[PDB]
Design a protein around this ligand. Sequence first.
Ligand SMILES: Cc1cc2nc3c(=O)[nH]c(=O)nc-3n(C[C@H](O)[C@H](O)[C@H](O)COP(=O)(O)O)c2cc1C
Length: 133
Amino acid sequence: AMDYSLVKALQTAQQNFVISDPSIPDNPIVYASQGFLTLTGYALSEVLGRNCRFLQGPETDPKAVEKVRKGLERGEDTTVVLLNYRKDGSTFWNQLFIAALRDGEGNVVNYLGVQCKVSEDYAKAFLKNEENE
Ligand SMILES: Cc1cc2nc3c(=O)[nH]c(=O)nc-3n(C[C@H](O)[C@H](O)[C@H](O)COP(=O)(O)O)c2cc1C
């Protein structure tokens, strides 16, 4: 990974994460941790140069996808819970944490996304609580 100290910190905990490069059209993945590859069932060669939206499918809530899109557009750290699909078509609940990695002038150089698999019970409680705003 472009070796930011926070990326090295996530590697020591064997977290699931990807790094995107917004200078490339459609803000594709340029790095994916072994944890992300094992969670999703994809080989690194199948993920590099693609936008992470390939994990979405028919049971994914498009309103959770829209929260991510608007968060990035507004330059905000974003946390959502949404249903994602593995390569084999099995589904899981993904608590997704996205941050901009910025230079000294505040320009976004990369996005960092951490995926945490959560239970259906946890996802329902998170989404119910989100809806009380
Ligand atoms: C670093 C990064 C990691 C992401 N990881 C995921 C993910 O694991 N699952 C997912 O459904 N979307 C993920 N996304 C969201 C999509 O890439 C995309 O931003 C989202 O679908 C909204 O844009 P769209 O309306 O063009 O689809 C991630 C985005 C970024 C920038």
